[PDB]
Ligand binder design. Structure first.
Ligand SMILES: CCCCCCCC(=O)OC[C@H](COP(=O)(O)O[C@@H]1[C@H](O)[C@H](O)[C@@H](OP(=O)(O)O)[C@H](OP(=O)(O)O)[C@H]1O)OC(=O)CCCCCCC
Lengths: 171, 86
């Protein structure tokens, strides 16, 4: 019922313990009971040093658990601008969807992270991507009262009258 | 986790010492003093201690590096004035 030691090291940003563990066990993609790699934990807590160590030891930057939550998804949802940058330089896929068809842009716009949304858009994220209910990122920005996120998405030519499956516009 | 010092590197004529401070230390101007058994106190120098938003155990810890940059390291701010609609 305790996490694997590499997950604990990733949570605490302990690069010495992580280095010892990876010297002993060379697998950086060890799975917890939920199926999250230590890179997921590092992206959640924005532990840059252990994330760089894991990626240098071969951690899958595009690891997809059963629920489809990549580390880029977690970094975009949490507002980790530096982690989003680092994952993008190491090859994080920009269009990957979760079980409910959420892109990292969806997670960024739902939580109103303007800088992350602009970074993802500048890397080619689909601004018109839809979830299972037909929600575009502008719908998630409007739902969270994220005025600047709505403004930025409109500046990037998001459809102002896009409808969901219930024919709901952002208005 | 408290005040501590340890020699990380040394040669015949020098010691490379790593000094730590507690995450709940009193801030302000400090003096570092060396006491060598059977000698008088020697002033090593002065340093100033501040709050640490980068340390997880500090009371002012910030989760995000971008937020740390924006709210502590950026000297170029914007004061919003005017009316609500302008
Ligand atoms: C009869 C008694 C014994 C005599 C023979 C004693 C023979 C003997 O043991 O010599 C070596 C020994 C070394 O002692 P050392 O200098 O390392 O120790 C310092 C000395 O005790 C100071 O008096 C202390 O000052 P204070 O109290 O803190 O203000 C100082 O405190 P702190 O630095 O730790 O804070 C001490 O570190 O004593 C001598 O000092 C030599 C001349 C001593 C005098 C020689 C004889 C008069």
């Amino acid at each position: 019922v305790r996490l694997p030691a590499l997950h604990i090291a990733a949570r605490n940003d302990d690069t010495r313990t992580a280095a010892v563990l990876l010297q002993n066990d060379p697998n950086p993609d060890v799975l917890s009971k939920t199926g999250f790699t230590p890179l997921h934990i590092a992206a959640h807590y924005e532990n840059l040093n252990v994330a760089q160590l894991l990626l240098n030891r071969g951690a899958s930057v595009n690891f997809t658990p059963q629920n489809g939550i990549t580390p880029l998804h977690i970094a975009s949802r949490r507002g980790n601008v530096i982690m989003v940058r680092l994952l993008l330089d190491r090859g994080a896929q920009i269009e990957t969807k979760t079980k409910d068809e959420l892109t990292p842009l969806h997670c960024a716009a739902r939580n109103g992270h303007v800088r992350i949304s602009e970074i993802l858009l500048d890397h080619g994220a689909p601004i018109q991507a839809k979830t299972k209910n037909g929600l575009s990122p502008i719908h998630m920005a409007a739902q969270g009262d994220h005025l600047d996120c709505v403004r930025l998405l409109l500046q990037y030519d998001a459809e102002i009258d896009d409808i969901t499956l219930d024919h709901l516009t952002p208005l | 986790k408290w005040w501590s010092a340890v020699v990380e590197e040394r040669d015949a004529q020098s010691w490379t010492i790593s000094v730590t401070t507690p995450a709940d230390a009193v801030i302000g101007h400090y003096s570092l003093l060396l006491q060598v058994s059977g000698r008088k106190q020697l002033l090593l120098g002065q340093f100033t201690l501040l709050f640490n938003p980068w340390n997880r155990e500090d009371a002012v810890f910030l989760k995000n590096e971008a937020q740390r940059m924006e709210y502590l390291l950026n000297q170029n701010g914007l004061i919003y004035l005017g009316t609500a609609d302008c």
